[PDB]
Design a protein around this ligand. Structure first.
Ligand SMILES: Cc1cc2nc3c(=O)[nH]c(=O)nc-3n(C[C@H](O)[C@H](O)[C@H](O)COP(=O)(O)OP(=O)(O)OC[C@H]3O[C@@H](n4cnc5c(N)ncnc54)[C@H](O)[C@@H]3O)c2cc1C
Ligand SMILES: Cc1cc2nc3c(=O)[nH]c(=O)nc-3n(C[C@H](O)[C@H](O)[C@H](O)COP(=O)(O)OP(=O)(O)OC[C@H]3O[C@@H](n4cnc5c(N)ncnc54)[C@H](O)[C@@H]3O)c2cc1C
Lengths: 462, 452, 116, 51
């Protein structure tokens, strides 16, 4: 039997943020996670491995396409294991840093499966015995989610994978099939295309990432097509069949596609079945998500849920800040803020980032805006980076010069979009495009785009 | 020829001034003595050095990456990559000039009176140009003291160093300036024992002490030998290597030599005495807050701070002042592109201590940064100086990979007025992950712990 | 011209937009549909739109004109969505009408629809 | 050569042989890179020697 003030379930970004914010408030807090090591999906099976894979693929592409490195010999193809082995050092460093953060503030951890009993009692169960019941006044739910696994699709087949088991690949397949045009699907399609795999990406919609800007989606589709990715639109699978040497997918429309592997990336389902939330009396929808208010509090006054478990936006930074806000709400130390605006980020090759309104929404809302474009092809920093494809678009109000939406696609997109976001968050006349002409930047960087694009807007203004 | 505004120099200052003036609807023209547009920024200064540094970083990462092991290269092969970037930049600038109907004259410009100039090319040209407004963007050149033989094949400057054909075994850099530090870092990355010589006791004293100390430690760990408080006595060029005798009594022998001490304005050929303008010892032109010289219709911009972006902004501000958009370029984020990069904005810790401002320090080390770990660049640091009571940001300093792109968020938060410029923004704003911009958040939290 | 506005994303409009972009003019193509040449394949339309965007052509989607005012130094087009675009010229390529009004088809019982 | 001919005989507006031949190396480099990629993707072993 153990007693605490705040107990967090799951050590992901939401759980870590909630635990840190709560322990900063002076309470005694504990964390529970069924994985043998801390970090959550952000470090073990999700963000960190995929990002290391993407960075290694980008380095491979740049090394192969750099003439200076071609004098040593001919281009060499590399196995998937060698590319993935670079993620082990990164995940080890990250888990060491996270456990050091936990230990420095003296936060107790319990590496075992969690299970709810009542409004205060939880049965943290290990693999062997370890009832180890815990009682606390406040609870944070950061159980996250797992890849969606339809019953009609078998996953025990060695040639069929999901967003988690794909890292278990031993050899680079000649071909590949990706179902679902989500963030994970597009990222893996870009990575495998960089590795040199004819990826047959399958989408359930007619446009890739319809929630993004039309121009950005069109450019991404063109680049994917130019990088051996075959994109099929308005498709629904009918049956997937595993063979000895490949996987054959028969679509509803009548097309059958055979590849050497398969990767399902269509949605995620919250990990709430093992929680036993019915003992609390709370309910989970078909998506496995938990309804929370603007204070990140569930129906029970002492039960708080935040992060990827609640569904939208399912972003690691967003989950982290949501957990911190939920902990602030628990402690009522005026640190709460409803996470609503999150800069959308897609980590393909190259990257995509967005903040604020899109062009289609602005057109529907009849806002008198204007467009300022800056193309990476004419950029000194981009030319030195040997990365020429890309663009940045700034949507700015014509009369008040207010910024209504910033969208970028290319190299360092996520780092670039942050300055536009910072200018966006300003109130009143401070949110102005003229800042980009009234402030000196560094050179040669990619931030100079915010200069050039601004000019491309001001010329269109009369 | 008759025009409204005539600009001398096609660098960032001149190009910006010409573009801003032509945006006003006037008829403008540009003159330069280089056979191609771009200025020293693209042809001899910024762009070639940046390409060299990026190639050095790439080869260093390739060598250190275990995946790429299953290989030293000559200096010429490394420098070859800059030609494509230079060609693309000059093509883009020529397209920008042509699309705007900008007349270009490729010859040295000399002043005749307050309104007209003579353009002389390589083959004895004479062209008269008269305009109401003039812009001076002649840039600068490396300072050349008399007592050093720059004609020696083993002695170079910040310009002729690109003429190197073979990578030297040892090298000497005089002057601990931004250019000197950048070249020392590049040559150290290439694998050359660089002996940097500094006149003062601290590298880049205008920077924060912590940043300078970290940079010095990294340079020392990267085969660069830094000597402090030294002044040259005599440079002697032997057939095999350059020998420098210092005032302290030391003799240093190397296979090359680079001079990066100071810059000299390119005003001797302008003949400013024909219009009533004088140049100081360093060849600079005194200007007011409007970037205007003593003559009412003569304006000078660009090549302090001698920054390409700052020169661009100064040229655009001078053009706006001519057309009546003016803004005095005073606060420029200092950026040194060594390996790793260094950037700073706002007041440093020494100035805050002198002024007794009650501030506090929030740190976020890049060693624990996830994105930095993926980049395999763990050495770094992000320091934020924030006012304790009103939570205003008084200084942002960064030393690491992608420092320049990081510092711009702190600069954007800085320029806000009053309560808007607050550190708590970094707590109430969702960043991208995994990014090193989100490191800001960590730093902010590392500050909020120290509050009470 | 310094700048140019093209109304209608038809064959003629796209051809002239490409020509003027090649000449080095910032073309602002205006389309009444959400996609360029919806009767064509999605991949081909996407590639053409990407090339036009990369070649200084600014494509705006789902727009309908409200008033084309002719200034002395340019033309300002006011759209239904609230966007006003100023250029140094203007080109109309929205459909064609049959040249049958002058034929006088009523003398033979023949008639033409609204499209001529 | 055809482009040179159409340049000289165009109302809108000699060349050294080396300058004219200079354009072929970009094409040959692109072609050899593409063929090497084709060989490597399907895993065909190469031996650069006299058989
Ligand atoms: C390939 C890939 C790449 C991604 N890249 C990004 C990216 O770049 N940026 C981004 O923002 N997001 C990214 N994501 C999304 C990412 O998964 C989430 O944004 C985030 O990592 C989840 O945060 P969380 O703490 O809410 O969930 P989690 O981190 O998944 O929290 C769940 C944790 O609790 C444990 N747990 C689960 N059930 C129980 C239980 N019953 N008892 C005890 N412990 C339990 C789990 O084992 C896990 O450790 C990516 C996802 C994938 C799959
Ligand atoms: C190695 C190196 C690295 C640098 N890196 C950076 C960096 O990363 N960032 C940064 O911001 N700055 C950097 N700089 C500084 C940069 O070179 C200057 O800040 C900037 O280029 C000056 O702009 P300008 O147009 O005023 O001068 P210039 O670019 O020098 O423009 C002067 C032009 O006019 C021509 N000219 C000169 N005299 C005459 C005449 N009498 N008649 C006609 N034409 C004439 C010159 O040939 C030249 O083309 C670097 C400098 C060096 C040497």
């Amino acid at each position: 039997v153990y007693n605490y003030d705040v107990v967090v379930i799951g050590t992901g970004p939401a759980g870590e943020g909630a635990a840190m914010n709560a322990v900063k408030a002076g309470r005694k807090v504990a964390v529970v996670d069924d994985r043998p090591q801390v970090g959550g999906n952000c470090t073990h099976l999700g963000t960190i491995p995929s990002k290391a894979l993407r960075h290694s693929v980008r380095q491979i592409m740049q090394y192969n396409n750099n003439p200076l490195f071609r004098q040593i010999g001919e281009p060499r193809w590399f196995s998937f294991a060698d590319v993935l082995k670079s993620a082990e050092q990164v995940i080890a460093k990250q888990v060491s840093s996270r456990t050091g953060y936990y230990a420095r503030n003296r936060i107790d951890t319990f590496f075992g499966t969690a299970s709810f009993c009542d409004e205060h009692t939880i049965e943290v169960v290990h693999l062997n015995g370890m009832v180890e019941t815990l009682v606390a006044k406040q609870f944070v739910i950061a159980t996250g989610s797992r890849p969606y696994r339809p019953a009609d699709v078998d996953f025990t087949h060695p040639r069929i994978y999901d967003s988690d088991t794909i890292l278990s690949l031993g050899h680079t397949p000649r071909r590949l099939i990706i179902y679902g045009a989500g963030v994970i699907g597009c990222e893996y399609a870009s990575i495998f295309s960089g590795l040199g795999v004819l990826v047959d990406l399958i989408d359930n919609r007619d446009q890739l990432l319809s929630f993004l800007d039309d121009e950005i989606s069109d450019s991404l589709s063109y680049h994917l097509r130019n990088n051996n990715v075959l994109i099929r639109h308005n498709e629904e699978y009918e049956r997937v069949e595993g063979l000895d040497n490949g996987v054959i997918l028969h679509l509803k429309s009548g097309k059958k596609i055979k590849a050497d592997a398969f990767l399902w990336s269509n949605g995620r389902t919250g990990n709430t079945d093992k929680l036993g939330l019915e003992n609390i009396g709370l309910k989970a929808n078909g998506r496995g998500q938990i309804q929370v208010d603007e204070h990140y509090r569930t129906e029970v006054s002492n039960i708080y849920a935040a992060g990827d478990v609640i569904g939208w936006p399912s972003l690691a930074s967003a989950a982290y800040d949501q957990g911190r806000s939920a902990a602030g709400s628990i402690t009522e130390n005026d640190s709460w803020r409803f996470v609503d605006d999150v800069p959308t980020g897609i980590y393909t090759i190259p990257e995509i980032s967005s903040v604020g309104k899109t062009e289609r929404e602005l057109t529907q809302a009849k806002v008198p805006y204007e467009v300022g474009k800056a193309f990476f092809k004419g950029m000194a920093r981009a030319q030195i980076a040997v990365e020429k494809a890309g663009m940045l678009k700034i949507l700015f109000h014509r009369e008040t010069l207010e910024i209504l939406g910033v969208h970028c696609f290319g190299y360092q997109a996520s780092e670039i979009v942050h300055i536009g976001q910072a200018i966006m968050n300003q109130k009143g006349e401070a949110n102005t495009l003229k800042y980009f002409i009234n402030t000196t930047f560094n050179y040669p960087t990619m931030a100079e785009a915010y200069r050039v694009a601004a000019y491309d807007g001001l010329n269109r203004l009369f």
